[PDB]
Amino acid sequence: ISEITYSDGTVIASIDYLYFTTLAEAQERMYDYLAQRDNVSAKELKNEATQKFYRDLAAKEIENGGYKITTTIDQKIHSAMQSAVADYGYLLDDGTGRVEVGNVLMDNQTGAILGFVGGRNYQENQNNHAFDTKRSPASTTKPLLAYGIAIDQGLMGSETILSNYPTNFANGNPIMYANSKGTGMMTLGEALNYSWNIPAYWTYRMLRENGVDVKGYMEKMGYEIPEYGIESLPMGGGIEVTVAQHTNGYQTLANNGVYHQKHVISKIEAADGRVVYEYQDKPVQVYSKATATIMQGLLREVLSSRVTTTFKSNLTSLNPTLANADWIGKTGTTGQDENMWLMLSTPRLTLGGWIGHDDNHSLSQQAGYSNNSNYMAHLVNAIQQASPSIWGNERFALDPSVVKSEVLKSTGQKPGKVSVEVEVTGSTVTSYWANKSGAPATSYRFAIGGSDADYQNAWSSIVGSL
Amino acid sequence: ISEITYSDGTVIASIDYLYFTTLAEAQERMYDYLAQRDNVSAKELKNEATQKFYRDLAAKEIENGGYKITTTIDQKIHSAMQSAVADYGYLLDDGTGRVEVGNVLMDNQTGAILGFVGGRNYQENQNNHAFDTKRSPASTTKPLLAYGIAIDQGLMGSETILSNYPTNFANGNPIMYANSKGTGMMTLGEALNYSWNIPAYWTYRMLRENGVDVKGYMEKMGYEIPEYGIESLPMGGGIEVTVAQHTNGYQTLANNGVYHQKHVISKIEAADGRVVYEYQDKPVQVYSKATATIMQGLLREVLSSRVTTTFKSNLTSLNPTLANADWIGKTGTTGQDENMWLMLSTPRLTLGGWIGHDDNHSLSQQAGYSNNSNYMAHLVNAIQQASPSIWGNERFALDPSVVKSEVLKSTGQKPGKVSVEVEVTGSTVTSYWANKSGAPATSYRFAIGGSDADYQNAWSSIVGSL
Ligand SMILES: *[B-](O)(O)[C@@H](C)NC(=O)c1c(F)cccc1-c1ccccc1
Ligand SMILES: *[B-](O)(O)[C@@H](C)NC(=O)c1c(F)cccc1-c1ccccc1
Ligand SMILES: [Cl-]
Ligand SMILES: [Cl-]
Ligand SMILES: [Cl-]
Ligand SMILES: [Cl-]
Ligand SMILES: [Cl-]
Ligand SMILES: [Cl-]
Ligand SMILES: [Cl-]
Ligand SMILES: [Cl-]
Ligand SMILES: [Cl-]
Ligand SMILES: [Cl-]
Ligand SMILES: [Cl-]
Ligand SMILES: [Cl-]
Ligand SMILES: [Cl-]
Ligand SMILES: [Cl-]
Ligand SMILES: [Cl-]
Ligand SMILES: [Cl-]
Ligand SMILES: [Cl-]
Ligand SMILES: [Cl-]
Ligand SMILES: [Cl-]
Ligand SMILES: [Cl-]
Ligand SMILES: [Cl-]
Ligand SMILES: [Cl-]
Ligand SMILES: [Cl-]
Ligand SMILES: [Cl-]
Ligand SMILES: [Cl-]
Ligand SMILES: [Cl-]
Ligand SMILES: [Cl-]
Ligand SMILES: [Cl-]
Ligand SMILES: [Cl-]
Ligand SMILES: [Cl-]
Ligand SMILES: [Cl-]
Ligand SMILES: [Cl-]
Ligand SMILES: [Cl-]
Ligand SMILES: [Cl-]
Ligand SMILES: [Cl-]
Ligand SMILES: [Cl-]
Ligand SMILES: [Cl-]
Ligand SMILES: [Cl-]
Ligand SMILES: [Cl-]
Ligand code: NA
Ligand code: NA
């Protein structure tokens, strides 16, 4: 009799979401192994009939063999997550009909998946919202694809200034943030905490203009994106992802820039002990340690500022000791309020969460800000109750390689002469950089993005202050 | 043997904060009764020696008599509040030393005090922060003394516009809100939700100019204020109050404008049943029902907007069903962050809370926003656990007498002709009023407060939009 087991060896079942997800993945590994065993070339595997036979063969082999499939799943934690969604899933319902949900809990140092939530109730709806449904990640794309890469390329630091002045897409439409056509200049921290859109637009524009290999970074983390020229890419335009894959992106940032490929199967052995498959770790430095650690600091403030999510307030009430762990994260909300995301990490673990409707109708305005945050606070509390040390008490900290520059608050660059020729001084602040030399001297166009009129307005204001 | 009892007759003690507070109040009632018994005039009671004798006589009479003193205190609820401060009082500590606390829970329909928190731990510090310490109520003065009275006088409604443009006190200092010198025009709701200062300044100025009997309202609720001409009175300047007295103010608003005097003693009987004192209710309509109910609606949004307090987020996590009760309230923060207040009501109950330091040193910036909110969410949860129906599931609702006016969003008054002679139309909204005829036609100076330059700026903007 073949068996699927938890990480510690307890049998899940002989051969709900856990059964089918792990069985499906084991059937794929078995497929690759039987093909290679029988000396079938990848050429011959392009034949549709041959492929179909091998897929069926893999399924029957597990069915009738006596294999032991070891999963990465932690019995107590996964069982805690099930009870949490059973007991607290109703908190998601926001007056737009039953709300669906998916979550993935991943170890930051290995990529192993310790538990997940497939949906509200398998018995009523089988869709797997953790591994199967693909949806836009919205503003949770920003740290990975815009700001993270720009920092990594030495094109901004932690206190760099960006334009949030009104501007239009190529098609002529205003770039909107809810009902605001934008404001003025702002720090990277303010842009992240509020999730403003115009600054991310300008950052990704800067990457395109500089010919940065953005695709290089994203493909190293396993993302598939068809068109890298989309202006709204940092807003989640032109990208769709599963919760499991997107959790792998935040794993990379949390693990000091080092990607480990997500997995739910660690090993498959035959009855006699022959190892027919075993996960092989292939760590990749996607972002520098300086970059990753600088981003951890910015995402810490995203949660603490409580601007786009009530999560920390929800958690501090439920479990004040756990709220004092070093949480960082990012929210996302798509165009018609169709998808809400919240991604969370501590130094040890990352937990991705999505909510939305199977038929893509809109959620309420507050679904992501309040309901999902509350539900996810209950989820993290439940996981901690089942495994008290799992989140850990370590802090994220800046890597030694980070470069610290004294910069003007107003410009985000070093004090100096500028022609408007004028002497620019004032309040200064420490800015973190991931390059060699740190921040440049202040120049006239000091910010990421902005038009001529924007800068006149901006400088009018700075000069008025010396 | 004399005894002090809970409301249901269970003995508290024969003759901690509960013992001494109720004993002190009973000694005062006994003093009045023995004086009148012995035919001593209020004249003779001005003699210091006579007074001293009667005070001592009152104390011994209780000591040696066999009186039964019935208190308003609910044993299960008060005992729940004690355990809550014991277990969760540490949540107040914010890195400025041990934080002290006081709370009072009052029935809105009677003024009876059902339980209270005197401090963190009587055994370590005896000061009674519920009944003895007087402190400025800060911005929690605004609803009672500025906006409530203005609405009551027919000088604003729910969507009236107020100036938050920069302006100075008489002494020449800018009116500040944290680090902001102010912005532009805003609705009453926005002014309340953010707790801006300039709008309250202008409202109280308008009351002074109109010669409104403000002292009439405040003295009907038992407040003692020495100087009504203080410009910062709505910000808590020139007023100090106990938590018990200030809770009585919010009782009045919550009870549809009807004040009932706070009390902890309901009756004192002699051993043979003679009633020597009994609370006599003297209800007073301080604000119209229209006014009170219009204010309830505005204070509901104060909590839901989560701008000055995390309370609703803290509560929704701890106890989602209880968070769905109809909570309204207001925060306060004094000048050097020396005192933080949060006052809460449902239709049945009001709970006042203060935190601060006995020697008046500053709290942290976030003490009121986060720590006190979290602690007070635990406190209300504990009270509900001890007495499941006590908060109630009723909603606050506008009184039938409220007048509803269709008004321009931009001006908060009815559409019409104005000279800048121009035709003013645009988006409209419903505004609630407590007078006969509702909102006036739009006039040039449409807002509460503002200078000539402010209005030019304001009208520039409105006219630019038709
Ligand atoms: B991002 O923060 O998810 C960003 C791209 N989302 C939005 O701008 C957005 C919509 F597309 C639709 C509705 C609301 C919002 C939004 C999200 C977050 C903060 C403000 C507004
Ligand atoms: B009121 O909201 O308590 C108001 C009078 N308080 C303040 O303006 C105030 C201080 F006097 C000192 C420190 C902070 C604040 C404050 C309070 C509430 C919101 C913003 C700023
Ligand atoms: Cl499945
Ligand atoms: Cl499952
Ligand atoms: Cl075979
Ligand atoms: Cl396990
Ligand atoms: Cl443009
Ligand atoms: Cl690219
Ligand atoms: Cl992908
Ligand atoms: Cl491209
Ligand atoms: Cl686009
Ligand atoms: Cl796998
Ligand atoms: Cl075998
Ligand atoms: Cl590195
Ligand atoms: Cl926080
Ligand atoms: Cl659906
Ligand atoms: Cl650090
Ligand atoms: Cl430097
Ligand atoms: Cl460099
Ligand atoms: Cl740029
Ligand atoms: Cl321009
Ligand atoms: Cl006392
Ligand atoms: Cl007590
Ligand atoms: Cl006597
Ligand atoms: Cl009782
Ligand atoms: Cl002035
Ligand atoms: Cl007066
Ligand atoms: Cl008083
Ligand atoms: Cl006066
Ligand atoms: Cl003053
Ligand atoms: Cl009394
Ligand atoms: Cl007697
Ligand atoms: Cl009335
Ligand atoms: Cl709310
Ligand atoms: Cl919050
Ligand atoms: Cl002190
Ligand atoms: Cl109503
Ligand atoms: Cl009307
Ligand atoms: Cl009238
Ligand atoms: Cl006025
Ligand atoms: Cl003027
Ligand atoms: Na968002
Ligand atoms: Na306040």
Side-chain angles (χ1 to χ4, degrees), chain B residues 351-376:
Chain B
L351 171 69
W354 158 97
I355 57 161
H357 287 300
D358 286 344
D359 66 4
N360 309 268
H361 79 272
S362 299
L363 301 165
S364 71
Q365 182 156 23
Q366 309 277 77
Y369 168 72
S370 181
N371 302 241
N372 194 35
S373 303
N374 187 16
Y375 159 78
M376 285 190 74

PDB file of all heavy atoms in Angstrom, chain B residues 351-376:
ATOM      1  N   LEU B 351     -18.345  54.052  28.845  1.00  0.00           N
ATOM      2  CA  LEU B 351     -17.125  53.700  29.537  1.00  0.00           C
ATOM      3  C   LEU B 351     -16.107  54.782  29.213  1.00  0.00           C
ATOM      4  O   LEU B 351     -15.779  55.024  28.038  1.00  0.00           O
ATOM      5  CB  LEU B 351     -16.622  52.312  29.102  1.00  0.00           C
ATOM      6  CG  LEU B 351     -15.241  51.909  29.588  1.00  0.00           C
ATOM      7  CD1 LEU B 351     -15.213  51.661  31.069  1.00  0.00           C
ATOM      8  CD2 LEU B 351     -14.676  50.678  28.835  1.00  0.00           C
ATOM      9  N   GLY B 352     -15.750  55.534  30.243  1.00  0.00           N
ATOM     10  CA  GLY B 352     -14.640  56.523  30.180  1.00  0.00           C
ATOM     11  C   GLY B 352     -13.298  55.878  30.514  1.00  0.00           C
ATOM     12  O   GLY B 352     -13.226  55.016  31.381  1.00  0.00           O
ATOM     13  N   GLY B 353     -12.237  56.324  29.846  1.00  0.00           N
ATOM     14  CA  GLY B 353     -10.865  55.898  30.185  1.00  0.00           C
ATOM     15  C   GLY B 353      -9.827  57.022  30.048  1.00  0.00           C
ATOM     16  O   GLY B 353      -9.820  57.791  29.065  1.00  0.00           O
ATOM     17  N   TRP B 354      -8.942  57.099  31.029  1.00  0.00           N
ATOM     18  CA  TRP B 354      -7.819  58.051  31.006  1.00  0.00           C
ATOM     19  C   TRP B 354      -6.580  57.241  31.289  1.00  0.00           C
ATOM     20  O   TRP B 354      -6.656  56.260  32.024  1.00  0.00           O
ATOM     21  CB  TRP B 354      -7.987  59.139  32.100  1.00  0.00           C
ATOM     22  CG  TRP B 354      -6.672  59.846  32.513  1.00  0.00           C
ATOM     23  CD1 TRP B 354      -6.210  61.054  32.050  1.00  0.00           C
ATOM     24  CD2 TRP B 354      -5.732  59.418  33.501  1.00  0.00           C
ATOM     25  NE1 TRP B 354      -5.018  61.384  32.656  1.00  0.00           N
ATOM     26  CE2 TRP B 354      -4.705  60.400  33.561  1.00  0.00           C
ATOM     27  CE3 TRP B 354      -5.657  58.306  34.365  1.00  0.00           C
ATOM     28  CZ2 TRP B 354      -3.634  60.302  34.442  1.00  0.00           C
ATOM     29  CZ3 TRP B 354      -4.537  58.173  35.193  1.00  0.00           C
ATOM     30  CH2 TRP B 354      -3.554  59.179  35.244  1.00  0.00           C
ATOM     31  N   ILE B 355      -5.459  57.638  30.685  1.00  0.00           N
ATOM     32  CA  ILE B 355      -4.131  57.211  31.126  1.00  0.00           C
ATOM     33  C   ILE B 355      -3.165  58.400  31.160  1.00  0.00           C
ATOM     34  O   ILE B 355      -3.341  59.393  30.421  1.00  0.00           O
ATOM     35  CB  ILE B 355      -3.512  56.079  30.192  1.00  0.00           C
ATOM     36  CG1 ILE B 355      -3.416  56.537  28.713  1.00  0.00           C
ATOM     37  CG2 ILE B 355      -4.389  54.810  30.240  1.00  0.00           C
ATOM     38  CD1 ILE B 355      -2.405  55.657  27.881  1.00  0.00           C
ATOM     39  N   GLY B 356      -2.116  58.259  31.958  1.00  0.00           N
ATOM     40  CA  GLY B 356      -1.131  59.311  32.172  1.00  0.00           C
ATOM     41  C   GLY B 356      -0.176  58.945  33.296  1.00  0.00           C
ATOM     42  O   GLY B 356      -0.205  57.819  33.820  1.00  0.00           O
ATOM     43  N   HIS B 357       0.644  59.907  33.719  1.00  0.00           N
ATOM     44  CA  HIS B 357       1.584  59.648  34.808  1.00  0.00           C
ATOM     45  C   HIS B 357       1.176  60.492  36.032  1.00  0.00           C
ATOM     46  O   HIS B 357       0.709  61.640  35.872  1.00  0.00           O
ATOM     47  CB  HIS B 357       2.998  59.995  34.364  1.00  0.00           C
ATOM     48  CG  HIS B 357       3.578  59.008  33.400  1.00  0.00           C
ATOM     49  ND1 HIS B 357       3.752  57.676  33.717  1.00  0.00           N
ATOM     50  CD2 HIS B 357       3.937  59.135  32.099  1.00  0.00           C
ATOM     51  CE1 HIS B 357       4.274  57.045  32.679  1.00  0.00           C
ATOM     52  NE2 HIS B 357       4.386  57.905  31.680  1.00  0.00           N
ATOM     53  N   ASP B 358       1.340  59.947  37.246  1.00  0.00           N
ATOM     54  CA  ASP B 358       0.974  60.738  38.427  1.00  0.00           C
ATOM     55  C   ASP B 358       1.733  62.071  38.511  1.00  0.00           C
ATOM     56  O   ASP B 358       1.176  63.082  38.938  1.00  0.00           O
ATOM     57  CB  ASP B 358       1.122  59.934  39.728  1.00  0.00           C
ATOM     58  CG  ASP B 358      -0.006  58.883  39.896  1.00  0.00           C
ATOM     59  OD1 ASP B 358      -1.019  58.984  39.189  1.00  0.00           O
ATOM     60  OD2 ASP B 358       0.117  57.952  40.717  1.00  0.00           O
ATOM     61  N   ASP B 359       2.975  62.106  38.057  1.00  0.00           N
ATOM     62  CA  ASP B 359       3.732  63.363  38.154  1.00  0.00           C
ATOM     63  C   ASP B 359       3.655  64.221  36.885  1.00  0.00           C
ATOM     64  O   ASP B 359       4.424  65.164  36.753  1.00  0.00           O
ATOM     65  CB  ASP B 359       5.185  63.084  38.504  1.00  0.00           C
ATOM     66  CG  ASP B 359       5.900  62.347  37.403  1.00  0.00           C
ATOM     67  OD1 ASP B 359       5.293  62.119  36.328  1.00  0.00           O
ATOM     68  OD2 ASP B 359       7.074  62.023  37.595  1.00  0.00           O
ATOM     69  N   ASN B 360       2.773  63.846  35.952  1.00  0.00           N
ATOM     70  CA  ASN B 360       2.476  64.605  34.706  1.00  0.00           C
ATOM     71  C   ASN B 360       3.598  64.619  33.663  1.00  0.00           C
ATOM     72  O   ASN B 360       3.524  65.389  32.705  1.00  0.00           O
ATOM     73  CB  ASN B 360       2.072  66.064  34.979  1.00  0.00           C
ATOM     74  CG  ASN B 360       0.984  66.193  36.016  1.00  0.00           C
ATOM     75  OD1 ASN B 360      -0.194  66.230  35.679  1.00  0.00           O
ATOM     76  ND2 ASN B 360       1.377  66.333  37.280  1.00  0.00           N
ATOM     77  N   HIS B 361       4.591  63.748  33.777  1.00  0.00           N
ATOM     78  CA  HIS B 361       5.512  63.609  32.641  1.00  0.00           C
ATOM     79  C   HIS B 361       4.848  62.982  31.393  1.00  0.00           C
ATOM     80  O   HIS B 361       3.760  62.390  31.501  1.00  0.00           O
ATOM     81  CB  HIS B 361       6.847  62.977  33.036  1.00  0.00           C
ATOM     82  CG  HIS B 361       6.810  61.491  33.183  1.00  0.00           C
ATOM     83  ND1 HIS B 361       6.479  60.868  34.371  1.00  0.00           N
ATOM     84  CD2 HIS B 361       7.190  60.508  32.334  1.00  0.00           C
ATOM     85  CE1 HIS B 361       6.630  59.562  34.236  1.00  0.00           C
ATOM     86  NE2 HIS B 361       7.102  59.321  33.023  1.00  0.00           N
ATOM     87  N   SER B 362       5.450  63.198  30.218  1.00  0.00           N
ATOM     88  CA  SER B 362       4.842  62.800  28.922  1.00  0.00           C
ATOM     89  C   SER B 362       4.771  61.277  28.728  1.00  0.00           C
ATOM     90  O   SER B 362       5.703  60.557  29.097  1.00  0.00           O
ATOM     91  CB  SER B 362       5.654  63.371  27.748  1.00  0.00           C
ATOM     92  OG  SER B 362       5.695  64.786  27.762  1.00  0.00           O
ATOM     93  N   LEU B 363       3.694  60.834  28.077  1.00  0.00           N
ATOM     94  CA  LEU B 363       3.564  59.507  27.501  1.00  0.00           C
ATOM     95  C   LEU B 363       4.185  59.481  26.104  1.00  0.00           C
ATOM     96  O   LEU B 363       4.486  60.526  25.536  1.00  0.00           O
ATOM     97  CB  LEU B 363       2.094  59.148  27.384  1.00  0.00           C
ATOM     98  CG  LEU B 363       1.294  59.137  28.682  1.00  0.00           C
ATOM     99  CD1 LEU B 363      -0.163  59.126  28.377  1.00  0.00           C
ATOM    100  CD2 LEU B 363       1.675  57.945  29.500  1.00  0.00           C
ATOM    101  N   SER B 364       4.296  58.295  25.519  1.00  0.00           N
ATOM    102  CA  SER B 364       4.700  58.211  24.125  1.00  0.00           C
ATOM    103  C   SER B 364       3.670  58.782  23.158  1.00  0.00           C
ATOM    104  O   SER B 364       2.444  58.840  23.424  1.00  0.00           O
ATOM    105  CB  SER B 364       5.050  56.780  23.730  1.00  0.00           C
ATOM    106  OG  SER B 364       3.855  56.026  23.686  1.00  0.00           O
ATOM    107  N   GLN B 365       4.157  59.076  21.963  1.00  0.00           N
ATOM    108  CA  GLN B 365       3.305  59.648  20.918  1.00  0.00           C
ATOM    109  C   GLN B 365       2.078  58.762  20.634  1.00  0.00           C
ATOM    110  O   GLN B 365       0.979  59.264  20.408  1.00  0.00           O
ATOM    111  CB  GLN B 365       4.155  59.829  19.650  1.00  0.00           C
ATOM    112  CG  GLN B 365       3.420  60.457  18.478  1.00  0.00           C
ATOM    113  CD  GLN B 365       4.368  61.137  17.503  1.00  0.00           C
ATOM    114  OE1 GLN B 365       5.557  60.815  17.444  1.00  0.00           O
ATOM    115  NE2 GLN B 365       3.845  62.091  16.740  1.00  0.00           N
ATOM    116  N   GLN B 366       2.267  57.449  20.729  1.00  0.00           N
ATOM    117  CA  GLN B 366       1.252  56.466  20.341  1.00  0.00           C
ATOM    118  C   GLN B 366       0.448  55.902  21.505  1.00  0.00           C
ATOM    119  O   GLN B 366      -0.335  54.977  21.298  1.00  0.00           O
ATOM    120  CB  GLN B 366       1.919  55.291  19.616  1.00  0.00           C
ATOM    121  CG  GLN B 366       2.845  55.694  18.485  1.00  0.00           C
ATOM    122  CD  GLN B 366       2.100  55.952  17.200  1.00  0.00           C
ATOM    123  OE1 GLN B 366       1.472  57.003  17.028  1.00  0.00           O
ATOM    124  NE2 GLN B 366       2.145  54.980  16.292  1.00  0.00           N
ATOM    125  N   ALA B 367       0.734  56.353  22.731  1.00  0.00           N
ATOM    126  CA  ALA B 367       0.068  55.824  23.924  1.00  0.00           C
ATOM    127  C   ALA B 367      -1.452  55.793  23.771  1.00  0.00           C
ATOM    128  O   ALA B 367      -2.116  54.864  24.236  1.00  0.00           O
ATOM    129  CB  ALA B 367       0.449  56.659  25.142  1.00  0.00           C
ATOM    130  N   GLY B 368      -2.022  56.895  23.300  1.00  0.00           N
ATOM    131  CA  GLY B 368      -3.481  56.981  23.227  1.00  0.00           C
ATOM    132  C   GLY B 368      -4.017  56.240  22.005  1.00  0.00           C
ATOM    133  O   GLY B 368      -4.967  55.479  22.107  1.00  0.00           O
ATOM    134  N   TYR B 369      -3.326  56.405  20.873  1.00  0.00           N
ATOM    135  CA  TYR B 369      -3.757  55.846  19.595  1.00  0.00           C
ATOM    136  C   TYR B 369      -3.830  54.316  19.659  1.00  0.00           C
ATOM    137  O   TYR B 369      -4.827  53.734  19.285  1.00  0.00           O
ATOM    138  CB  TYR B 369      -2.768  56.263  18.506  1.00  0.00           C
ATOM    139  CG  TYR B 369      -2.894  55.554  17.184  1.00  0.00           C
ATOM    140  CD1 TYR B 369      -3.971  55.814  16.320  1.00  0.00           C
ATOM    141  CD2 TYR B 369      -1.892  54.686  16.764  1.00  0.00           C
ATOM    142  CE1 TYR B 369      -4.047  55.190  15.064  1.00  0.00           C
ATOM    143  CE2 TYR B 369      -1.957  54.060  15.528  1.00  0.00           C
ATOM    144  CZ  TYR B 369      -3.043  54.317  14.689  1.00  0.00           C
ATOM    145  OH  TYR B 369      -3.080  53.689  13.483  1.00  0.00           O
ATOM    146  N   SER B 370      -2.832  53.697  20.277  1.00  0.00           N
ATOM    147  CA  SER B 370      -2.669  52.257  20.189  1.00  0.00           C
ATOM    148  C   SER B 370      -2.809  51.612  21.586  1.00  0.00           C
ATOM    149  O   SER B 370      -3.733  50.849  21.817  1.00  0.00           O
ATOM    150  CB  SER B 370      -1.281  51.948  19.629  1.00  0.00           C
ATOM    151  OG  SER B 370      -1.113  50.547  19.516  1.00  0.00           O
ATOM    152  N   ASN B 371      -1.917  51.929  22.521  1.00  0.00           N
ATOM    153  CA  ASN B 371      -1.888  51.180  23.831  1.00  0.00           C
ATOM    154  C   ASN B 371      -3.208  51.244  24.588  1.00  0.00           C
ATOM    155  O   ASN B 371      -3.762  50.196  24.998  1.00  0.00           O
ATOM    156  CB  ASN B 371      -0.778  51.691  24.752  1.00  0.00           C
ATOM    157  CG  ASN B 371       0.598  51.590  24.127  1.00  0.00           C
ATOM    158  OD1 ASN B 371       1.469  50.899  24.636  1.00  0.00           O
ATOM    159  ND2 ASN B 371       0.810  52.316  23.058  1.00  0.00           N
ATOM    160  N   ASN B 372      -3.690  52.461  24.846  1.00  0.00           N
ATOM    161  CA  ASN B 372      -4.972  52.609  25.568  1.00  0.00           C
ATOM    162  C   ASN B 372      -6.162  51.952  24.821  1.00  0.00           C
ATOM    163  O   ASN B 372      -7.072  51.411  25.451  1.00  0.00           O
ATOM    164  CB  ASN B 372      -5.300  54.096  25.798  1.00  0.00           C
ATOM    165  CG  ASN B 372      -6.423  54.296  26.824  1.00  0.00           C
ATOM    166  OD1 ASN B 372      -6.533  53.549  27.795  1.00  0.00           O
ATOM    167  ND2 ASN B 372      -7.231  55.321  26.624  1.00  0.00           N
ATOM    168  N   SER B 373      -6.170  52.053  23.488  1.00  0.00           N
ATOM    169  CA  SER B 373      -7.211  51.465  22.667  1.00  0.00           C
ATOM    170  C   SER B 373      -7.240  49.968  22.828  1.00  0.00           C
ATOM    171  O   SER B 373      -8.327  49.384  22.929  1.00  0.00           O
ATOM    172  CB  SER B 373      -7.019  51.843  21.191  1.00  0.00           C
ATOM    173  OG  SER B 373      -6.996  53.271  21.081  1.00  0.00           O
ATOM    174  N   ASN B 374      -6.052  49.356  22.787  1.00  0.00           N
ATOM    175  CA  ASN B 374      -5.899  47.910  22.968  1.00  0.00           C
ATOM    176  C   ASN B 374      -6.366  47.481  24.389  1.00  0.00           C
ATOM    177  O   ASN B 374      -7.183  46.565  24.541  1.00  0.00           O
ATOM    178  CB  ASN B 374      -4.431  47.522  22.749  1.00  0.00           C
ATOM    179  CG  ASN B 374      -4.208  46.005  22.746  1.00  0.00           C
ATOM    180  OD1 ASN B 374      -5.164  45.223  22.604  1.00  0.00           O
ATOM    181  ND2 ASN B 374      -2.939  45.593  22.817  1.00  0.00           N
ATOM    182  N   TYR B 375      -5.867  48.183  25.406  1.00  0.00           N
ATOM    183  CA  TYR B 375      -6.247  47.908  26.789  1.00  0.00           C
ATOM    184  C   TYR B 375      -7.762  48.047  26.946  1.00  0.00           C
ATOM    185  O   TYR B 375      -8.394  47.193  27.570  1.00  0.00           O
ATOM    186  CB  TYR B 375      -5.504  48.853  27.773  1.00  0.00           C
ATOM    187  CG  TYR B 375      -6.185  48.978  29.123  1.00  0.00           C
ATOM    188  CD1 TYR B 375      -6.065  47.968  30.088  1.00  0.00           C
ATOM    189  CD2 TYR B 375      -7.008  50.083  29.408  1.00  0.00           C
ATOM    190  CE1 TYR B 375      -6.735  48.064  31.342  1.00  0.00           C
ATOM    191  CE2 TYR B 375      -7.646  50.196  30.645  1.00  0.00           C
ATOM    192  CZ  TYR B 375      -7.515  49.187  31.588  1.00  0.00           C
ATOM    193  OH  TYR B 375      -8.170  49.316  32.769  1.00  0.00           O
ATOM    194  N   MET B 376      -8.349  49.094  26.360  1.00  0.00           N
ATOM    195  CA  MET B 376      -9.777  49.312  26.545  1.00  0.00           C
ATOM    196  C   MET B 376     -10.611  48.308  25.756  1.00  0.00           C
ATOM    197  O   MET B 376     -11.717  47.940  26.191  1.00  0.00           O
ATOM    198  CB  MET B 376     -10.205  50.735  26.167  1.00  0.00           C
ATOM    199  CG  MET B 376      -9.756  51.762  27.284  1.00  0.00           C
ATOM    200  SD  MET B 376     -10.417  53.408  27.138  1.00  0.00           S
ATOM    201  CE  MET B 376     -12.144  53.166  27.677  1.00  0.00           C
TER     202      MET B 376
END
